[PDB]
Amino acid sequence: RQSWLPGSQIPAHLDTPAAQALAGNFGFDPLGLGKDPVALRWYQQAELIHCRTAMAGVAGILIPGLLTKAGALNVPEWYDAGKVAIENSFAPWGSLLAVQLFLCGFVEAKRWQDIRKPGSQGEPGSFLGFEASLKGTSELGYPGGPFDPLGLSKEADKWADWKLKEVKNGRLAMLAFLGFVAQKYATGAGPVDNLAAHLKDPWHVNYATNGVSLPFL
Amino acid sequence: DIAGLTPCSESKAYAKLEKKELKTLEKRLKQYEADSAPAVALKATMERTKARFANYAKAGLLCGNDGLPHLIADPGLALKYGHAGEVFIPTFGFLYVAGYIGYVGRQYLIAVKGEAKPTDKEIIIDVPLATKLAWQGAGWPLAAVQELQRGTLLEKEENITVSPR
Amino acid sequence: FGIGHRMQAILEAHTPPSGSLGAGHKGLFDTVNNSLHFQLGLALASVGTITSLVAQHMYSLPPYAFQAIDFTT
Amino acid sequence: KAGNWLPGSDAPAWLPDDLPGNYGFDPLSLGKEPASLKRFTESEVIHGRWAMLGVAGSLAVELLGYGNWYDAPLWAVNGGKATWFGIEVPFDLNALLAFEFVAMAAAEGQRGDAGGVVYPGGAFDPLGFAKDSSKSGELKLKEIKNGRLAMVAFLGFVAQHAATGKGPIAALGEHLANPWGANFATNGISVPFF
Amino acid sequence: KAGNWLPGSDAPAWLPDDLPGNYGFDPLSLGKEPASLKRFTESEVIHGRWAMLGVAGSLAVELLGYGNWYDAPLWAVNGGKATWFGIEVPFDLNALLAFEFVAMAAAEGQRGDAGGVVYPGGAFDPLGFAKDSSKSGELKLKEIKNGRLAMVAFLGFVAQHAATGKGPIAALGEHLANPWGANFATNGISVPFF
Amino acid sequence: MKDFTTYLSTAPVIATIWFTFTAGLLIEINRYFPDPLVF
Amino acid sequence: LDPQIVISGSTAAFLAIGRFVFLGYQRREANFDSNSTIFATNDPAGFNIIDVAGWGALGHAVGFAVLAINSLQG
Ligand code: CLA
Ligand code: CLA
Ligand code: CLA
Ligand SMILES: CC1=C[C@H](O)CC(C)(C)[C@H]1/C=C/C(C)=C/C=C/C(C)=C/C=C/C=C(C)/C=C/C=C(C)/C=C/C1=C(C)C[C@H](O)CC1(C)C
Ligand SMILES: CC1=C[C@H](O)CC(C)(C)[C@H]1/C=C/C(C)=C/C=C/C(C)=C/C=C/C=C(C)/C=C/C=C(C)/C=C/C1=C(C)C[C@H](O)CC1(C)C
Ligand SMILES: CC1=C[C@H](O)CC(C)(C)[C@H]1/C=C/C(C)=C/C=C/C(C)=C/C=C/C=C(C)/C=C/C=C(C)/C=C/C1=C(C)C[C@H](O)CC1(C)C
Ligand SMILES: CC1=C(/C=C/C(C)=C/C=C/C(C)=C/C=C/C=C(C)/C=C/C=C(C)/C=C/C2=C(C)CCCC2(C)C)C(C)(C)CCC1
Ligand SMILES: CCCCCCCCCCCCO[C@@H]1O[C@H](CO)[C@@H](O[C@H]2O[C@H](CO)[C@@H](O)[C@H](O)[C@H]2O)[C@H](O)[C@H]1O
Ligand SMILES: CCCCCCCC/C=C/CCCCCCCC(=O)OC[C@@H](O)COP(=O)(O)O
Ligand SMILES: CC(=O)/C=C/C=C(C)/C=C/[C@H]1[C@H](C)CCCC1(C)C
Structure with missing residues (x-):
């Protein structure tokens, strides 16, 4: 049994056969937020959405930032890309956010309805024939049809491992974005610049030297 | 600006009040020596006064005709004119700590309620269980919302005692 | 003279269909017309509210001549 | 049932299947009482009819060139x-109020x-388009759907006028001229923080 | 079936063999249900017919010297x-939209x-090119294949225009004049690293 | 020691220790952050 | 504005909507609303003197309101 703390008392709610079926089960729940099975299922969906969203965002911040350091691209910093992208644009940020909220609300409402009732999106005569493809697999949060065009989820032997590479990576991405924010309020530069400045002198450039992360020192 | 008030960084009464406080402190300081404990204490108080006035003017507070700051309690005005730090953020901070303490106490009561003698657990606090619940109460809003959605937060009408009407 | 209303009918015809108020105002005409303490309580509540209204309106909106200059009054 | 307003959600039990425009949309459970649901049906049909006539009139006046619906009673x-x-x-x-009040009082009475x-x-029904009750089902749905659409359209007319100052056709021409740059998120009235 | 899109791969079990243009190409399994497959079949045939007319019209108007397909509504x-x-x-x-909308709505209805x-x-079918059902299926295969090619061609028209700016005939001559210097890799937006 | 810990676990002793800890935390917070009126 | 024309028209109009429009509704509500005097009349629809006085009062009030509003010149 893999654990996040060797010797710590693993919670009973995380030891059930249903809880162990989730990917990345390391028995980490010191606050007991997953005692309720309904709450655990909802939080599992939230963790999956956060993992995918954080992975896409951190990728869109790290890859163009790494290409900017080289001569591949000239993408500005993530904390300044919004202003630069809205300057020479075709619409203000308010109109764009309104269209975004509408388009995101529709799909999130459909996802919410499928979470409330699995496979309910396949109601006949409701999506111009595309309702059949809107029914996900047996596991919540893992749909097929239009999603997953390559069909890599049909092989079960790697499926259980595939999900492990999706949650864990996502968790890392979730911390990555957090660092991106903290570093922004601690050094004032970008993440790639902070990485290079740290690699230049690791013994004197860290969180214990900026004076912000350790005010008592 | 809002309600006919002016910012503390541009109020004459605010500066006059600061000069009055510094004047009375300096007047009290002139009666002592230079390398004595009361003089150092008075200088420290004066530095604290200067830092307090500078910080209040730096925060963008709105002062009145008396030179004293004013708080904005309307959420719209606070979030629209940069006054959310006065009454909005501390409101949510107190809500978090209040629900935190309430949830910890409720969890302790429900936990000791099923034991043999709950009154002993009430007069003599079970420090290990109380400490565990105190550390676990960080997720109080999530646990409270999940409890409310499940219907286990409230007790039924038939299980509560009432008057004979 | 035939025309007009009956307070009992208006009271008995004011119950929401959702059952939020229970039986609504059914039987309120008999419990008020036959109880002098209920009528006295309603009258005193309205009178006290009107008295406070009088105090506020008279100091803010002076109705009598040369009344604002008289501070003691 | 004509359709499902929330694909994958169970329809309310108090809503009949043969009701025109029955999409199962009632989150507040206002039509749970059978007597209340009876009044709400005729209320919705009457509202839809009035809104359809109002929207048609407001569109026709501005399409012909006699001002907008808001500038129509400006002569009095x-x-x-x-x-x-x-x-x-x-x-x-004064003469219009007496005539309209008497005519509407008689009709509504x-x-x-x-x-x-x-x-x-x-x-x-002088043309006899709904003589048989078997074919009136497919025609009643059209009336209730057009009525609901016209109700939303009139509400939008009032909202866009109160938030911009221009008539319905004027708001359409401006939006066709600049869709991304002129909408409800750019008037400064609808969403204040945008 | 007309063949296999992916050699070595087995065709899906829900695609009928008698369907015209059946190549077993369905990795997303969108036509899993027969009700959705029928609607998608009619939609695909109609899309192919409209795409054929659109591609033929664009090529004809550009080869006749009356401007490219993009500069067609520029007069309005x-x-x-x-x-x-x-x-x-x-x-x-204003008058073209009315007649086109009325005629198209009536025909499509x-x-x-x-x-x-x-x-x-x-x-x-006044000429009777499909009088016998034996040869009707063969021409249907040609129809759906030409429609698929037309849809791909129209997508190529829009993509090449948004990537370069020139029209389909002007892009063909440019590519024939400089094949290595004028292609999808030299436009500047397909590959940002080059 | 069990009886001593049980005595220290009573309501007045626990209240005294808890209020002393809370008061000390608030006093030290105001000491290192003098005059906090806003956030 | 002529006062005679306005008052006569308002009174006649409300008496007409009281006798030919809202008579049945008022009679049905008065019946369900449940020493006295019965006012017998020869009107076929039972429009007694009490209803005439009430409708005439409403008509005169509305007519005088119209006359006053038009007198204000607004
Ligand atoms: C606890 C009671 C309470 C009271 C007495 C008020 C009172 C007020 N609020 Mg409010 N508000 C409250 C709770 C309260 N609020 C809460 C809990 C929230 C969080 C949702 C808000 C969020 C809020 C916002 C975002 C705004 C106000 C605003 C206002 C002021 C005018 C609007 C109004 O009266 O309609 C009641 C307020 C609401 C129903 C909230 C929606 C805002 C309405 C639609 C007004 C917006 C229109 C426009 C901006 C008005 C400004 C006109 C002019 C000065 C430019 C007014 C003094 C407005 C303001 O003056 O901006 C500085 C403003 O925009 N409030
Ligand atoms: C588990 C602790 C607890 C909880 C969850 C509540 C909760 C509640 N109380 Mg209550 N109360 C408590 C303890 C508690 N009380 C105690 C010890 C007293 C005696 C002083 C009171 C006296 C009291 C009165 C007179 C009233 C309430 C009321 C209420 C309700 C309104 C909210 C409020 O903040 O009121 C105010 C809360 C207080 C005045 C006391 C708070 C005391 C602390 C902060 C609570 C925790 C103390 C405890 C020692 C910690 C647990 C230790 C454990 C972890 C080891 C609410 C449901 C009101 C009501 O009737 O309901 C609408 C009301 O009128 N309470
Ligand atoms: C018959 C529905 C309808 C239509 C066709 C329009 C059309 C239009 N409106 Mg309008 N509006 C509507 C309803 C409608 N509105 C309603 C109900 C309200 C009150 C909330 C408003 C309030 C409003 C304001 C304040 C403004 C407009 C404006 C405009 C114009 C610019 C687009 C825009 O930003 O609007 C936005 C409309 C909404 C956010 C609400 C639309 C309601 C639904 C979502 C649309 C109809 C449903 C649609 C047929 C199918 C939806 C499916 C989809 C969600 C997937 C445009 C021509 C702006 C203008 O004047 O132009 C410069 C303007 O400022 N509208
Ligand atoms: C488990 C648990 C339980 C127990 O009981 C207790 C405890 C301990 C508490 C716990 C823990 C928790 C945690 C840690 C959490 C966290 C989370 C996160 C971090 C998230 C994020 C998350 C994150 C996310 C999503 C993110 C996303 C992002 C994005 C979109 C981005 C975007 C962008 C880009 C691209 C670029 C531009 O230029 C900018 C922007 C616009 C900005
Ligand atoms: C269903 C439900 C149930 C659940 O449970 C809950 C909820 C959600 C709440 C719901 C919903 C609701 C709603 C939405 C409503 C709305 C309505 C409307 C809009 C109406 C209108 C309606 C509307 C209408 C009638 C309108 C009408 C109009 C008119 C007549 C007009 C007139 C006119 C004209 C001609 C023109 C001129 O120049 C002026 C005038 C004179 C002015
Ligand atoms: C099958 C499947 C299944 C699996 O599983 C999955 C997936 C992959 C999803 C799939 C695939 C899909 C696809 C490929 C699609 C595509 C489509 C298209 C392209 C269409 C178009 C389509 C297209 C179209 C109609 C087009 C049309 C056009 C037109 C009419 C034109 C017109 C015109 C002309 C004459 C010229 C002038 O100057 C202008 C105008 C007036 C403008
Ligand atoms: C027999 C007959 C008939 C009838 C006739 C007649 C002619 C009747 C009538 C009647 C009338 C002709 C009535 C009227 C009336 C009136 C009244 C009843 C009134 C009143 C009053 C009041 C109450 C007022 C008040 C006031 C004042 C004092 C001041 C200012 C304000 C007001 C205006 C409010 C006929 C031929 C149809 C048919 C056959 C048989
Ligand atoms: C902005 C201008 C437009 C706004 C105008 C609003 C004016 C509304 C006037 C309402 C007048 C009430 O008028 C009266 O209504 C009742 C109540 O339904 C109708 O009453 C009718 O329906 C009710 C049930 O609802 C039955 O009990 C009754 O027996 C029947 O007559 C009367 O036939 C009508 O005479
Ligand atoms: C019921 C469920 C509700 C779910 C709601 C989900 C909300 C979706 C979240 C969206 C993220 C919000 C990000 C957009 C806001 C940040 C944009 C912004 O802050 O820009 C404004 C400002 O810089 C522009 O300033 P100028 O360029 O100086 O005008
Ligand atoms: C934009 C708008 O308002 C709606 C247009 C919808 C249509 C034409 C749908 C029509 C039919 C469909 C495919 C289902 C069966 C009946 C119809 C009329 C053939």
């Missing part, structure tokens, strides 16, 4: 005379005395 | 008059009221 407030289709009308505001009738027929 | 952006084959047309954009008929025939 500052020395003006009503013009219908470019023809002068010899009636003051007969309708109310009828007993909540939603589909009168007969004298109201 | 700045104010002008449309010219079909060099002959002036006195209809403006009549077509959709039949219940999704893909191959009507009769009045639409």
Whole structure:
């Protein structure tokens, strides 16, 4: 049994056969937020959405930032890309956010309805024939049809491992974005610049030297 | 600006009040020596006064005709004119700590309620269980919302005692 | 003279269909017309509210001549 | 049932299947009581009919060039005379109130005395398009759907006028000229923080 | 079936063999249900017919020297008059949308009221090219294949225009004049690293 | 020691220790952050 | 504005909507609303003197309101 703390008392709610079926089960729940099975299922969906969203965002911040350091691209910093992208644009940020909220609300409402009732999106005569493809697999949060065009989820032997590479990576991405924010309020530069400045002198450039992360020192 | 008030960084009464406080402190300081404990204490108080006035003017507070700051309690005005730090953020901070303490106490009561003698657990606090619940109460809003959605937060009408009407 | 209303009918015809108020105002005409303490309580509540209204309106909106200059009054 | 307003959600039990426009949309459970649901049906049909006529009139006046629906009663407030289709009308505001009040009182009085009738027929159907009750089902749905759409359209007319100051056609032309740059998120009234 | 899209891969078990243009290409399994497959079949045939007409019209108008397909509604952006084959047309954009909308709505309503008929025939087949059902299936394969090619061609038209700016005929001549110097890799937006 | 810990676990002793800890935390917070009126 | 025309028209109009429009509704509500005097009349629809006085009062009030509003010149 893999654990996040060797010797710590693993919670009973995380030891059930249903809880162990989730990917990345390391028995980490010191606050007991997953005692309720309904709450655990909802939080599992939230963790999956956060993992995918954080992975896409951190990728869109790290890859163009790494290409900017080289001569591949000239993408500005993530904390300044919004202003630069809205300057020479075709619409203000308010109109764009309104269209975004509408388009995101529709799909999130459909996802919410499928979470409330699995496979309910396949109601006949409701999506111009595309309702059949809107029914996900047996596991919540893992749909097929239009999603997953390559069909890599049909092989079960790697499926259980595939999900492990999706949650864990996502968790890392979730911390990555957090660092991106903290570093922004601690050094004032970008993440790639902070990485290079740290690699230049690791013994004197860290969180214990900026004076912000350790005010008592 | 809002309600006919002016910012503390541009109020004459605010500066006059600061000069009055510094004047009375300096007047009290002139009666002592230079390398004595009361003089150092008075200088420290004066530095604290200067830092307090500078910080209040730096925060963008709105002062009145008396030179004293004013708080904005309307959420719209606070979030629209940069006054959310006065009454909005501390409101949510107190809500978090209040629900935190309430949830910890409720969890302790429900936990000791099923034991043999709950009154002993009430007069003599079970420090290990109380400490565990105190550390676990960080997720109080999530646990409270999940409890409310499940219907286990409230007790039924038939299980509560009432008057004979 | 035939025309007009009956307070009992208006009271008995004011119950929401959702059952939020229970039986609504059914039987309120008999419990008020036959109880002098209920009528006295309603009258005193309205009178006290009107008295406070009088105090506020008279100091803010002076109705009598040369009344604002008289501070003691 | 014509359809499902929330794909994958169970329809309310108090809503009949043969009701026109029955999409199962009632989160507040307002039609749970059978008597209340009966009044709400005729109320919705009457509202849809009035809104359809109102939206058609507001569109026709601006499409022909006689101002918007908001500028229509502006003649009675500052020395003006009503013009219908470019023809002068010899009636003051006081005379219009008496005639409209008497006519509407008579019409609505007969309708109310009828007993909540939603589909009168007969004298109201001179062309006989709903003689058979078997084919009236596919035509009643069209009426309720067009009525709901016109209700939303009139509400939008009032909202866009109160938030911009221009008529319905004027807001359409401006939006067709600049869709991304001129919408509800750019008027400064709808969303204040945008 | 007309063949296999991916050699070595088995065709899906829900695709009928008698369907025209059946290549077993369905990795997303969108036509899993027979009800959705019928609608998608009619939609694909109609899309192919419209794509064929659109591609033929764009190529014809560009080869006849009447501008590219992108500069077709440009006369109604700045104010002008449309010219079909060099002959002036006195209809403006406001009147063109009305007649086209009315005629298209009537024709599409009549077509959709039949219940999704893909191959009507009769009045639409006066020459009798499909009198015998033995050879009717062979021409259907050609029809769906030409439609698929036309849809891909129209997608290519839009993509190459948004990537370069020149029209389909102007892009063909440019590519024939400089194949290594004028292609999808030299436009500048397909590959940002190059 | 069990009886001593049980005595220290009573309501007045626990209240005294808890209020002393809370008061000390608030006092030290105001000491290192003098005059906090806003956030 | 002529006072006679306005008052006469308002009174006649409300008496007409009281006798030919809202008579049945008022009679049905008065019946369900449940020493006295019965006012017998020869009107076929039972429009007694009490209803005439009430409708005439409403008509006169509305007519005088119209006259006053038009007198204000607004
Ligand atoms: C606890 C009671 C309470 C009271 C007495 C008020 C009172 C007020 N609020 Mg409010 N508000 C409250 C709770 C309260 N609020 C809460 C809990 C929230 C969080 C949702 C808000 C969020 C809020 C916002 C975002 C705004 C106000 C605003 C206002 C002021 C005018 C609007 C109004 O009266 O309509 C009641 C307020 C609401 C129903 C909230 C929606 C805002 C309405 C639609 C007004 C917006 C229109 C426009 C901006 C008005 C400004 C006109 C002009 C000065 C430019 C007014 C003094 C407005 C303001 O003055 O901006 C500085 C403003 O925009 N409030
Ligand atoms: C588990 C602790 C607890 C909880 C969850 C509540 C909760 C509640 N109380 Mg209550 N109360 C408590 C303890 C608690 N009380 C105690 C010890 C007293 C005696 C002083 C009171 C006296 C009291 C009165 C007179 C009233 C309430 C009321 C209420 C309700 C309104 C909210 C409020 O803040 O009121 C105010 C809360 C207080 C005045 C006391 C708070 C005391 C602390 C902060 C609570 C925790 C103390 C405890 C020692 C910690 C647990 C230790 C454990 C972890 C080892 C609410 C449901 C009101 C009501 O009737 O309901 C609408 C009301 O009128 N309470
Ligand atoms: C019949 C529905 C309808 C239509 C066709 C329009 C059309 C239009 N409106 Mg309008 N509006 C509507 C309803 C509608 N509105 C309603 C109900 C309200 C009150 C909330 C408003 C309030 C409003 C304001 C304040 C403004 C407009 C404006 C405009 C114009 C610019 C687009 C825009 O930003 O609007 C936005 C409309 C909404 C956010 C609400 C639309 C309601 C639904 C979502 C649309 C109809 C449903 C649609 C047929 C199918 C939806 C499916 C989809 C969600 C997937 C445009 C021509 C702006 C203008 O004047 O132009 C410069 C303007 O400022 N509208
Ligand atoms: C488990 C648990 C339980 C127990 O009981 C207790 C405890 C301990 C408490 C716990 C823990 C928790 C945690 C840690 C959490 C966290 C989370 C996160 C971090 C998230 C994020 C998350 C994150 C996310 C999503 C993110 C996303 C992002 C994005 C979109 C981005 C975007 C962008 C880009 C691209 C670029 C531009 O230029 C900018 C922007 C616009 C900005
Ligand atoms: C269903 C439900 C149930 C659940 O449970 C809950 C909820 C959600 C709440 C719901 C919903 C609701 C809603 C939405 C409502 C709305 C309505 C409307 C809009 C109406 C209108 C309606 C509307 C209407 C009638 C309108 C009408 C109009 C008119 C007549 C007009 C007139 C006119 C004209 C001609 C023009 C001129 O120049 C002026 C005038 C004179 C002015
Ligand atoms: C099958 C499947 C299944 C699996 O599983 C999955 C997936 C992959 C999803 C799939 C695939 C899909 C696809 C490929 C699609 C595509 C489509 C298209 C492209 C269409 C178009 C389509 C297209 C179209 C109609 C087009 C049309 C056009 C037109 C009419 C044109 C017109 C015109 C002309 C003459 C020229 C002038 O100057 C202008 C105009 C006036 C403008
Ligand atoms: C027999 C007969 C008949 C009838 C006739 C007649 C002619 C009747 C009538 C009647 C009338 C002709 C009535 C009227 C009336 C009136 C009244 C009843 C009134 C009143 C009053 C009041 C109450 C007022 C008040 C006031 C004042 C004092 C001041 C200012 C304000 C007001 C205006 C409010 C006929 C031929 C149809 C048919 C046959 C038989
Ligand atoms: C902005 C201008 C437009 C706004 C105008 C609003 C004016 C509304 C006037 C309402 C007048 C009430 O008028 C009266 O209504 C009742 C109540 O339904 C109708 O009453 C009818 O339906 C009710 C049930 O609802 C039955 O009990 C009754 O027997 C029947 O007559 C009457 O036939 C009508 O005479
Ligand atoms: C019921 C469920 C509700 C779910 C709601 C989900 C909300 C979706 C979240 C969206 C993220 C919000 C990000 C957009 C806001 C940040 C944009 C912004 O802050 O820009 C404004 C400002 O810089 C522009 O300033 P100028 O360029 O100086 O005008
Ligand atoms: C934009 C708008 O308002 C709606 C247009 C919808 C249509 C034409 C749908 C029509 C049919 C469909 C495919 C289902 C069966 C009946 C119809 C008329 C053939």
